[PDB]
mmCIF file of C-alpha atoms (C1' of nucleotides) in Angstrom:
data_model
loop_
_atom_site.group_PDB
_atom_site.id
_atom_site.type_symbol
_atom_site.label_atom_id
_atom_site.label_comp_id
_atom_site.label_asym_id
_atom_site.label_seq_id
_atom_site.Cartn_x
_atom_site.Cartn_y
_atom_site.Cartn_z
ATOM 1 C CA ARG A 1 -0.335 0.262 0.086
ATOM 2 C CA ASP A 2 1.125 3.587 -0.205
ATOM 3 C CA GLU A 3 -0.228 5.975 2.579
ATOM 4 C CA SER A 4 1.309 9.357 1.301
ATOM 5 C CA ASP A 5 -1.068 11.944 3.486
ATOM 6 C CA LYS A 6 1.005 14.254 2.693
ATOM 7 C CA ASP A 7 3.274 14.199 6.027
ATOM 8 C CA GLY A 8 6.174 12.410 4.405
ATOM 9 C CA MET A 9 5.845 9.904 2.640
ATOM 10 C CA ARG A 10 4.504 5.839 3.792
ATOM 11 C CA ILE A 11 4.934 2.702 1.786
ATOM 12 C CA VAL A 12 3.446 -0.327 3.595
ATOM 13 C CA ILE A 13 4.704 -3.817 3.007
ATOM 14 C CA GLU A 14 3.184 -6.310 5.340
ATOM 15 C CA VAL A 15 5.812 -9.433 5.711
ATOM 16 C CA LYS A 16 4.076 -12.840 6.182
ATOM 17 C CA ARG A 17 4.622 -14.223 8.911
ATOM 18 C CA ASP A 18 6.740 -17.097 8.294
ATOM 19 C CA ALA A 19 9.331 -14.263 7.098
ATOM 20 C CA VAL A 20 11.841 -12.789 8.814
ATOM 21 C CA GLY A 21 11.025 -9.070 7.369
ATOM 22 C CA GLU A 22 15.269 -8.374 7.505
ATOM 23 C CA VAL A 23 15.755 -10.647 4.617
ATOM 24 C CA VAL A 24 12.762 -9.570 2.921
ATOM 25 C CA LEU A 25 13.967 -5.990 3.311
ATOM 26 C CA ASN A 26 17.321 -6.803 2.031
ATOM 27 C CA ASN A 27 15.968 -8.702 -1.218
ATOM 28 C CA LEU A 28 14.044 -5.327 -1.933
ATOM 29 C CA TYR A 29 17.047 -3.672 -1.802
ATOM 30 C CA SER A 30 18.946 -6.073 -3.858
ATOM 31 C CA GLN A 31 16.588 -6.320 -6.878
ATOM 32 C CA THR A 32 14.059 -3.509 -6.155
ATOM 33 C CA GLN A 33 14.589 0.500 -7.132
ATOM 34 C CA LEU A 34 15.102 1.132 -3.125
ATOM 35 C CA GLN A 35 18.398 1.148 -3.500
ATOM 36 C CA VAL A 36 20.128 3.089 -7.148
ATOM 37 C CA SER A 37 23.843 3.892 -8.263
ATOM 38 C CA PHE A 38 23.797 7.273 -8.559
ATOM 39 C CA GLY A 39 27.474 7.931 -11.503
ATOM 40 C CA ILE A 40 28.781 10.996 -11.086
ATOM 41 C CA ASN A 41 30.564 12.686 -14.277
ATOM 42 C CA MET A 42 31.172 16.349 -13.861
ATOM 43 C CA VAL A 43 31.434 17.562 -16.956
ATOM 44 C CA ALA A 44 30.322 21.601 -17.784
ATOM 45 C CA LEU A 45 31.553 23.623 -20.703
ATOM 46 C CA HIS A 46 34.864 25.429 -19.283
ATOM 47 C CA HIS A 47 35.931 28.422 -21.372
ATOM 48 C CA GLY A 48 33.875 27.279 -23.638
ATOM 49 C CA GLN A 49 34.885 23.505 -23.773
ATOM 50 C "C1'" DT B 1 -8.633 13.137 -104.226
ATOM 51 C "C1'" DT B 2 -9.106 8.527 -102.921
ATOM 52 C "C1'" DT B 3 -7.272 4.950 -100.392
ATOM 53 C "C1'" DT B 4 -3.592 2.244 -97.110
ATOM 54 C "C1'" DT B 5 -0.862 0.454 -92.403
ATOM 55 C "C1'" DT B 6 0.359 1.486 -87.820
ATOM 56 C "C1'" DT B 7 -0.594 2.563 -83.273
ATOM 57 C "C1'" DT B 8 -3.228 2.422 -78.743
ATOM 58 C "C1'" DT B 9 -6.895 2.518 -74.997
ATOM 59 C "C1'" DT B 10 -11.183 0.005 -74.506
ATOM 60 C "C1'" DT B 11 -15.988 -3.500 -75.138
ATOM 61 C "C1'" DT B 12 -13.413 -5.203 -71.544
ATOM 62 C "C1'" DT B 13 -14.088 -10.692 -68.566
ATOM 63 C "C1'" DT B 14 -11.420 -14.318 -66.070
ATOM 64 C "C1'" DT B 15 -6.803 -16.020 -63.663
ATOM 65 C "C1'" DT B 16 -3.949 -15.012 -59.479
ATOM 66 C "C1'" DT B 17 -2.847 -13.280 -55.264
ATOM 67 C "C1'" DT B 18 -4.387 -10.146 -50.885
ATOM 68 C "C1'" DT B 19 -7.255 -8.323 -47.921
ATOM 69 C "C1'" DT B 20 -11.060 -9.001 -44.256
ATOM 70 C "C1'" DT B 21 -14.630 -11.783 -41.616
ATOM 71 C "C1'" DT B 22 -14.403 -15.912 -38.491
ATOM 72 C "C1'" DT B 23 -14.158 -19.324 -34.047
ATOM 73 C "C1'" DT B 24 -10.823 -24.296 -31.127
ATOM 74 C "C1'" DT B 25 -7.235 -25.043 -27.783
ATOM 75 C "C1'" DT B 26 -3.820 -23.651 -23.729
ATOM 76 C "C1'" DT B 27 -3.642 -19.688 -20.521
ATOM 77 C "C1'" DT B 28 -6.346 -16.406 -16.850
ATOM 78 C "C1'" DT B 29 -9.672 -15.158 -13.656
ATOM 79 C "C1'" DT B 30 -13.645 -14.923 -9.247
ATOM 80 C "C1'" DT B 31 -16.246 -18.215 -6.858
ATOM 81 C "C1'" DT B 32 -16.633 -21.552 -3.209
ATOM 82 C "C1'" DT B 33 -13.881 -24.479 -0.345
ATOM 83 C "C1'" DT B 34 -11.045 -26.322 2.891
ATOM 84 C "C1'" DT B 35 -6.269 -25.392 6.037
ATOM 85 C "C1'" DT B 36 -4.863 -22.056 9.967
ATOM 86 C "C1'" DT B 37 -4.195 -18.679 14.367
ATOM 87 C "C1'" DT B 38 -6.387 -16.538 19.206
ATOM 88 C "C1'" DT B 39 -9.806 -16.085 22.957
ATOM 89 C "C1'" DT B 40 -13.463 -18.530 27.405
ATOM 90 C "C1'" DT B 41 -14.128 -21.505 30.385
ATOM 91 C "C1'" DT B 42 -14.606 -25.529 31.715
ATOM 92 C "C1'" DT B 43 -14.648 -29.896 33.645
ATOM 93 C "C1'" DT B 44 -11.286 -31.802 33.234
ATOM 94 C "C1'" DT B 45 -6.286 -33.420 33.618
ATOM 95 C "C1'" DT B 46 -1.959 -33.161 35.951
ATOM 96 C "C1'" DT B 47 1.624 -31.444 38.921
ATOM 97 C "C1'" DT B 48 3.791 -32.505 43.657
ATOM 98 C "C1'" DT B 49 4.184 -34.455 49.159
ATOM 99 C "C1'" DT B 50 3.790 -38.682 52.987
ATOM 100 C "C1'" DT B 51 3.346 -44.411 53.160
ATOM 101 C "C1'" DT B 52 3.501 -48.759 51.604
ATOM 102 C "C1'" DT B 53 4.545 -53.557 50.037
ATOM 103 C "C1'" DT B 54 6.852 -55.071 45.839
ATOM 104 C "C1'" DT B 55 9.879 -57.845 42.430
ATOM 105 C "C1'" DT B 56 14.428 -57.362 39.956
ATOM 106 C "C1'" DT B 57 19.722 -57.095 40.910
ATOM 107 C "C1'" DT B 58 23.412 -58.395 42.818
ATOM 108 C "C1'" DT B 59 26.506 -63.093 46.978
ATOM 109 C "C1'" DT B 60 27.944 -67.324 44.305
ATOM 110 C "C1'" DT B 61 28.573 -71.770 40.386
ATOM 111 C "C1'" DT B 62 27.064 -74.293 35.495
ATOM 112 C "C1'" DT B 63 27.031 -74.939 30.210
ATOM 113 C "C1'" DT B 64 26.617 -74.039 25.242
ATOM 114 C "C1'" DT B 65 25.869 -71.904 20.911
ATOM 115 C "C1'" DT B 66 27.516 -68.415 18.948
ATOM 116 C "C1'" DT B 67 32.105 -66.251 19.287
ATOM 117 C "C1'" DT B 68 36.631 -68.503 17.886
ATOM 118 C "C1'" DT B 69 39.150 -69.170 13.115
ATOM 119 C "C1'" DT B 70 41.237 -70.405 7.745
ATOM 120 C "C1'" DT B 71 40.366 -69.880 3.291
ATOM 121 C "C1'" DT B 72 38.173 -70.496 -1.914
ATOM 122 C "C1'" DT B 73 36.179 -67.515 -5.389
ATOM 123 C "C1'" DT B 74 32.963 -65.150 -5.917
ATOM 124 C "C1'" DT B 75 31.414 -59.703 -7.271
ATOM 125 C "C1'" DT B 76 30.826 -55.662 -5.605
ATOM 126 C "C1'" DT B 77 34.002 -52.115 -6.417
ATOM 127 C "C1'" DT B 78 36.949 -49.032 -8.819
ATOM 128 C "C1'" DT B 79 39.074 -47.294 -13.316
ATOM 129 C "C1'" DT B 80 38.520 -45.199 -17.867
ATOM 130 C "C1'" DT B 81 35.362 -43.043 -21.316
ATOM 131 C "C1'" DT B 82 31.505 -40.917 -22.804
ATOM 132 C "C1'" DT B 83 26.500 -38.384 -22.357
ATOM 133 C "C1'" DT B 84 23.138 -35.220 -19.550
ATOM 134 C "C1'" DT B 85 22.639 -31.541 -16.395
ATOM 135 C "C1'" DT B 86 23.322 -27.992 -13.816
ATOM 136 C "C1'" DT B 87 25.596 -23.223 -12.942
ATOM 137 C "C1'" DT B 88 28.470 -18.937 -14.431
ATOM 138 C "C1'" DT B 89 30.511 -15.564 -17.812
ATOM 139 C "C1'" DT B 90 29.402 -12.960 -22.029
ATOM 140 C "C1'" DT B 91 26.435 -11.401 -25.473
ATOM 141 C "C1'" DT B 92 22.136 -8.582 -26.719
ATOM 142 C "C1'" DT B 93 18.601 -5.792 -26.579
ATOM 143 C "C1'" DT B 94 16.033 -2.416 -23.479
ATOM 144 C "C1'" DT B 95 14.121 1.268 -20.012
ATOM 145 C "C1'" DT B 96 14.902 5.924 -17.767
ATOM 146 C "C1'" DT B 97 17.546 10.277 -17.018
ATOM 147 C "C1'" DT B 98 16.760 16.124 -19.640
ATOM 148 C "C1'" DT B 99 16.804 19.131 -23.961
ATOM 149 C "C1'" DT B 100 15.742 18.779 -28.877
ATOM 150 C "C1'" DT B 101 12.807 17.456 -34.029
ATOM 151 C "C1'" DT B 102 8.204 16.262 -35.381
ATOM 152 C "C1'" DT B 103 3.256 15.274 -35.080
ATOM 153 C "C1'" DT B 104 -2.223 13.153 -33.635
ATOM 154 C "C1'" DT B 105 -6.887 12.735 -31.752
ATOM 155 C "C1'" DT B 106 -12.283 12.638 -28.879
ATOM 156 C "C1'" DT B 107 -16.583 15.882 -27.596
ATOM 157 C "C1'" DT B 108 -20.700 20.766 -27.581
ATOM 158 C "C1'" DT B 109 -23.364 24.259 -30.096
ATOM 159 C "C1'" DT B 110 -26.957 25.456 -35.075
ATOM 160 C "C1'" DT B 111 -27.906 24.511 -39.806
ATOM 161 C "C1'" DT B 112 -28.025 23.053 -44.341
ATOM 162 C "C1'" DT B 113 -26.893 19.203 -47.611
ATOM 163 C "C1'" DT B 114 -26.082 14.407 -48.989
ATOM 164 C "C1'" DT B 115 -27.035 9.595 -48.108
ATOM 165 C "C1'" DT B 116 -29.142 5.226 -46.920
ATOM 166 C "C1'" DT B 117 -34.211 2.479 -45.051
ATOM 167 C "C1'" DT B 118 -39.809 2.637 -44.765
ATOM 168 C "C1'" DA C 1 -41.665 11.072 -50.715
ATOM 169 C "C1'" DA C 2 -40.977 10.672 -45.057
ATOM 170 C "C1'" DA C 3 -37.362 9.704 -41.443
ATOM 171 C "C1'" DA C 4 -32.700 9.319 -40.308
ATOM 172 C "C1'" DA C 5 -27.343 9.830 -39.896
ATOM 173 C "C1'" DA C 6 -22.767 11.577 -41.230
ATOM 174 C "C1'" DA C 7 -20.031 15.579 -42.002
ATOM 175 C "C1'" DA C 8 -18.983 20.727 -42.444
ATOM 176 C "C1'" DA C 9 -18.533 25.010 -41.238
ATOM 177 C "C1'" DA C 10 -15.772 27.987 -35.929
ATOM 178 C "C1'" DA C 11 -14.805 29.469 -30.706
ATOM 179 C "C1'" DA C 12 -14.066 26.377 -26.871
ATOM 180 C "C1'" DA C 13 -13.299 22.142 -23.290
ATOM 181 C "C1'" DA C 14 -9.483 18.033 -22.746
ATOM 182 C "C1'" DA C 15 -5.879 14.243 -24.266
ATOM 183 C "C1'" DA C 16 -2.103 10.925 -27.061
ATOM 184 C "C1'" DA C 17 2.611 9.632 -29.602
ATOM 185 C "C1'" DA C 18 7.945 8.899 -32.246
ATOM 186 C "C1'" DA C 19 13.335 9.627 -32.975
ATOM 187 C "C1'" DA C 20 18.394 11.673 -31.181
ATOM 188 C "C1'" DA C 21 22.241 11.769 -28.249
ATOM 189 C "C1'" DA C 22 25.798 9.034 -23.393
ATOM 190 C "C1'" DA C 23 25.954 5.910 -19.096
ATOM 191 C "C1'" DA C 24 23.881 2.792 -16.038
ATOM 192 C "C1'" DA C 25 21.044 -0.999 -15.070
ATOM 193 C "C1'" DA C 26 18.375 -4.754 -15.456
ATOM 194 C "C1'" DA C 27 15.905 -9.980 -18.290
ATOM 195 C "C1'" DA C 28 16.842 -13.107 -21.152
ATOM 196 C "C1'" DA C 29 19.186 -15.698 -23.914
ATOM 197 C "C1'" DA C 30 23.626 -18.329 -25.003
ATOM 198 C "C1'" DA C 31 28.703 -20.771 -24.572
ATOM 199 C "C1'" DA C 32 31.585 -23.623 -21.817
ATOM 200 C "C1'" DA C 33 33.545 -25.316 -17.276
ATOM 201 C "C1'" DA C 34 31.622 -28.703 -14.131
ATOM 202 C "C1'" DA C 35 30.154 -32.249 -11.782
ATOM 203 C "C1'" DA C 36 26.029 -36.660 -11.304
ATOM 204 C "C1'" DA C 37 24.594 -40.416 -14.240
ATOM 205 C "C1'" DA C 38 25.353 -44.573 -16.521
ATOM 206 C "C1'" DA C 39 28.014 -48.585 -19.485
ATOM 207 C "C1'" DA C 40 31.625 -51.692 -19.576
ATOM 208 C "C1'" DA C 41 37.162 -53.683 -18.340
ATOM 209 C "C1'" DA C 42 39.596 -56.138 -14.192
ATOM 210 C "C1'" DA C 43 39.789 -56.976 -9.848
ATOM 211 C "C1'" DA C 44 39.766 -58.418 -3.957
ATOM 212 C "C1'" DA C 45 36.907 -57.801 1.082
ATOM 213 C "C1'" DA C 46 32.793 -60.573 2.230
ATOM 214 C "C1'" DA C 47 30.243 -65.307 3.275
ATOM 215 C "C1'" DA C 48 31.002 -69.793 3.191
ATOM 216 C "C1'" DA C 49 32.694 -73.257 5.598
ATOM 217 C "C1'" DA C 50 34.981 -75.607 9.819
ATOM 218 C "C1'" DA C 51 36.603 -76.839 14.068
ATOM 219 C "C1'" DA C 52 37.017 -75.087 18.264
ATOM 220 C "C1'" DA C 53 35.961 -72.308 22.216
ATOM 221 C "C1'" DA C 54 33.843 -69.948 27.268
ATOM 222 C "C1'" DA C 55 30.705 -65.562 28.874
ATOM 223 C "C1'" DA C 56 26.005 -64.792 29.917
ATOM 224 C "C1'" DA C 57 21.243 -66.317 30.781
ATOM 225 C "C1'" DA C 58 19.085 -69.571 34.336
ATOM 226 C "C1'" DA C 59 18.450 -70.835 39.640
ATOM 227 C "C1'" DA C 60 18.359 -69.750 44.877
ATOM 228 C "C1'" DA C 61 17.360 -65.538 47.572
ATOM 229 C "C1'" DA C 62 17.824 -60.908 50.059
ATOM 230 C "C1'" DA C 63 16.183 -56.408 49.966
ATOM 231 C "C1'" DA C 64 15.500 -51.612 48.320
ATOM 232 C "C1'" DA C 65 13.714 -48.524 44.745
ATOM 233 C "C1'" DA C 66 9.447 -48.440 43.740
ATOM 234 C "C1'" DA C 67 3.929 -47.704 40.914
ATOM 235 C "C1'" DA C 68 -0.755 -47.734 43.829
ATOM 236 C "C1'" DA C 69 -3.463 -45.400 47.109
ATOM 237 C "C1'" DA C 70 -4.368 -40.586 49.424
ATOM 238 C "C1'" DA C 71 -4.375 -35.769 49.522
ATOM 239 C "C1'" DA C 72 -4.614 -31.264 48.098
ATOM 240 C "C1'" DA C 73 -3.829 -27.487 44.662
ATOM 241 C "C1'" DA C 74 -2.475 -25.661 40.165
ATOM 242 C "C1'" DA C 75 -4.596 -24.946 35.710
ATOM 243 C "C1'" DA C 76 -2.255 -27.499 30.148
ATOM 244 C "C1'" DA C 77 -5.359 -28.690 26.820
ATOM 245 C "C1'" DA C 78 -10.689 -29.463 23.982
ATOM 246 C "C1'" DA C 79 -14.754 -27.171 22.229
ATOM 247 C "C1'" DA C 80 -17.097 -23.475 20.968
ATOM 248 C "C1'" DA C 81 -17.412 -19.199 18.536
ATOM 249 C "C1'" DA C 82 -14.924 -15.645 15.156
ATOM 250 C "C1'" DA C 83 -11.394 -14.369 11.120
ATOM 251 C "C1'" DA C 84 -7.726 -15.128 7.646
ATOM 252 C "C1'" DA C 85 -4.103 -18.204 4.095
ATOM 253 C "C1'" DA C 86 -4.571 -20.486 0.275
ATOM 254 C "C1'" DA C 87 -5.802 -24.080 -3.078
ATOM 255 C "C1'" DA C 88 -9.440 -26.955 -7.659
ATOM 256 C "C1'" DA C 89 -13.776 -25.865 -9.967
ATOM 257 C "C1'" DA C 90 -15.813 -23.478 -13.550
ATOM 258 C "C1'" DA C 91 -15.927 -20.354 -17.716
ATOM 259 C "C1'" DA C 92 -13.534 -16.785 -20.398
ATOM 260 C "C1'" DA C 93 -9.972 -15.431 -24.450
ATOM 261 C "C1'" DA C 94 -6.243 -14.005 -28.848
ATOM 262 C "C1'" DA C 95 -4.043 -15.462 -31.842
ATOM 263 C "C1'" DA C 96 -5.242 -18.638 -35.456
ATOM 264 C "C1'" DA C 97 -6.578 -21.976 -39.617
ATOM 265 C "C1'" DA C 98 -10.723 -21.803 -42.981
ATOM 266 C "C1'" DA C 99 -13.813 -19.334 -46.146
ATOM 267 C "C1'" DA C 100 -15.291 -15.612 -49.200
ATOM 268 C "C1'" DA C 101 -14.807 -10.243 -51.555
ATOM 269 C "C1'" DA C 102 -11.590 -7.011 -54.112
ATOM 270 C "C1'" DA C 103 -7.521 -5.260 -56.799
ATOM 271 C "C1'" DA C 104 -3.934 -6.243 -60.444
ATOM 272 C "C1'" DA C 105 -1.970 -8.711 -64.951
ATOM 273 C "C1'" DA C 106 -3.843 -10.684 -69.287
ATOM 274 C "C1'" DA C 107 -3.601 -10.755 -73.724
ATOM 275 C "C1'" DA C 108 -8.100 -11.262 -78.556
ATOM 276 C "C1'" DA C 109 -10.174 -8.199 -81.524
ATOM 277 C "C1'" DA C 110 -11.395 -3.235 -83.017
ATOM 278 C "C1'" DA C 111 -12.318 2.452 -82.813
ATOM 279 C "C1'" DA C 112 -10.427 5.966 -83.420
ATOM 280 C "C1'" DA C 113 -6.498 8.506 -84.591
ATOM 281 C "C1'" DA C 114 -1.479 9.174 -86.864
ATOM 282 C "C1'" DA C 115 0.338 8.924 -91.034
ATOM 283 C "C1'" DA C 116 2.102 8.694 -95.930
ATOM 284 C "C1'" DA C 117 1.780 6.500 -100.735
ATOM 285 C "C1'" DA C 118 0.733 7.740 -105.655
#
DNA sequence: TTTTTTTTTTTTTTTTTTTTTTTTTTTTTTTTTTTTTTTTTTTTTTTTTTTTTTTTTTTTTTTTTTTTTTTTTTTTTTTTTTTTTTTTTTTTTTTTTTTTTTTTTTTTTTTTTTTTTT
DNA sequence: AAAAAAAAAAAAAAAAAAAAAAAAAAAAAAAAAAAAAAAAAAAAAAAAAAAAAAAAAAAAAAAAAAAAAAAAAAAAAAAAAAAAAAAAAAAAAAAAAAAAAAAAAAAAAAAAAAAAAA
C-alpha cells in the first residue's frame, strides 16, 4: 500500500508471518529500485570547451 | 482526291493474389471450499508431598551356542570413457534520465446538405 | 416522398505519440566449465565353511527402589465462536486455421487516330 498523507511518504509492505522481514528488506534493496547507483560524471563548459 | 498501314485504350471478363471476417485450444481469473490462529471457561487433566508392599539385581556356580577361526571364489568395487544436466561468463536488447525534431485525436452548439431505409 | 444519420463550417473543453544523444542498470538468451549419472573392463573384501571354544541367561533368595493409594492444589488442553490463507472448479479468451470478396495482370480484337503512297 501507499499511505502518503502529505506528511512524508509511507509505503507499507506487510511481511508474511513465516518470514523475517529483514531478509525481505534486503531482497528488496538488492532487486527493486530502493537502492540505485548514481554515476557521477562532472563535465562542464570551461572557457567554452 | 481517294485509299492503305500501324498504334493504342477500350468493349473489357477471367485467373491470381491479397485483404478482411471468422471461431478451437491452453492460459487467466472469480468463486466456494478446506487448512491455519486467537480468546473463554470448563470440567477436566495434571504437578507435587507422604506411606506402603513389592519384584528385579546383585553374593556364587554351571554350560553351550554364539564367538573363535582359515581359506575359495565369488562380485561388488573401482577405473576409464562418454553423455546429460547444472551452473556461471558473455553478449544482446530494452528502459530511464533531460533538451531537441516532428506530429495525432474525442466531444458541444446550429443549420444545411447528402445518403440510406420505410 | 417521409425518417434517420454523417459531414462540414468556427470558437471552446480535454488529451496522446515517434525518434536522437550517453551511461547505468536489469532481463534474457547463449557457450562452456564442471560435476552426477551410466556402460563396460579388471579386480579384491566378504560370506562361506569348519573346528574349536568359553561368557552370560538360569536358578536360589534377600532387600531396596518402587507404582498404587490418598490428599491438596495448579492450571494445560478441548470445544465453541470468529477471522484469515491458500487451493480446485468452472468459465472466458486471443491468436489462428478456414472461408469469401476485391485489386492487378492478361492478352483477343476493334474504334479512333496518325501518318504516308500514288
